[PDB]
Design a protein around this ligand. Structure first.
Ligand SMILES: CCOc1nn(-c2ccccc2)c(NC(=O)N[C@@H]2CN(CCOC)C[C@H]2c2ccc(F)c(F)c2)c1C
Ligand code: NA
Length: 302
């Protein structure tokens, strides 16, 4: 296909992995939550009891099957969970856990220093998110990425738009395939239809279309910057081509105001020009999680 972030750009190793099929009588559509080029998302009830987000197919069918066979492989606390397919009737559905707070980018922006309401609530204290919470968000996204690297998957569109936030402030990697419709400003249109997330991409991905665990690490560095900026667009001062110009010359995003120097060093180790020089995601995870769980006395003074 060529679409960065599309799960089917990865290789299928287990061509016989089984896919769970859910009966029509076990699903009750409640209402629409959203809509893109390739589908509609609905809240539903799934029975044997629980709320689910279902993605309805628009139309493709072979892509659908390939997507379900790969998505049955992804089972991890920090990947949005895929429960199966409902193919008896229309629409064809893929069924996922429901993530109440929506996408992480919107969640950051709405709990940041420019938000309207910063009242305390179920999952968040009254101010903007504090350090320990920004660290816990980062850590969970990094943990999802350690899992993907363990299984030889490469995401290619890692960004806060492509993570979801659930109840209890649980952050998982996932999207319903509509980020180019909803956040089209984060993509650079080169083709008649190609849309590249160039502000999250390292030089080798931009120039050669090479994608590895290491270009994903670079993107994770950019995610870190988005978390510590409360969801700002990287290089927001710059047009797409200017950002390419920056990235290519080797300029680095600046330390955000809410980012301690220790955390900035982590970002920087993800942004080495040479892919083999970049930190390993297992080490980034390990450091961020250790920081998230550090004593408040230490974190208060970073
Ligand atoms: C032509 C359609 O373009 C796309 N479709 N989808 C897609 C397809 C099926 C289910 C959900 C999204 C996607 N995105 C997509 O595959 N994302 C994967 C689904 N996510 C879980 C469900 O969260 C709701 C995980 C995410 C993902 C994970 C690891 C990867 F390596 C990867 F490439 C994508 C795009 C760009
Ligand atoms: Na990548």
């Amino acid at each position: 296909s060529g679409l960065q972030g599309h799960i089917i750009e990865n290789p299928q190793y287990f061509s016989d992995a089984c896919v769970h099929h859910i009966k029509r009588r076990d699903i009750v559509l409640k209402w629409e939550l959203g809509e893109g080029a390739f589908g509609k998302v609905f809240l539903a009830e799934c029975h044997n009891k629980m709320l689910v987000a279902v993605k309805a197919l628009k139309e493709a069918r072979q892509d659908f099957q390939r997507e379900a066979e790969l998505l049955t492989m992804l089972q991890h606390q920090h990947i949005v969970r895929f429960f199966g397919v409902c193919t008896e009737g229309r629409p064809l559905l893929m069924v996922f856990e429901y993530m109440r707070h929506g996408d992480l980018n919107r969640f950051l922006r709405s709990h940041g220093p420019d938000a309207k309401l910063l009242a305390g609530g179920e999952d968040v204290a009254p101010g903007p998110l504090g350090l320990g919470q920004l660290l816990a968000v980062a850590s969970q996204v990094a943990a999802g990425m350690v899992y993907l690297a363990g299984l030889h998957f490469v995401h290619r569109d890692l960004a806060t738009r492509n993570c979801l936030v659930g109840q209890g402030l649980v952050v998982k990697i996932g999207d319903f395939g509509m980020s180019r419709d909803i956040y089209s400003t984060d993509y650079y249109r080169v083709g008649g239809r190609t849309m590249l997330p160039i502000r999250w991409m390292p030089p080798e991905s931009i120039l050669y279309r090479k994608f590895t665990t290491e270009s994903d690490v670079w993107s994770f560095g950019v995610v870190l910057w988005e978390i510590f900026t409360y969801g700002k667009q990287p290089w927001y001062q710059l047009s797409n081509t200017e950002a390419i110009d920056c990235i290519t010359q080797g300029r680095e995003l600046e330390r955000p105001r809410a980012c301690p120097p220790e955390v900035y060093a982590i970002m920087r180790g993800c942004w080495q020009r040479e892919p083999q020089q970049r930190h390993s995601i297992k080490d980034v995870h390990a450091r961020l999680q250790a920081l998230a769980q550090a004593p408040p006395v230490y974190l208060d003074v970073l």
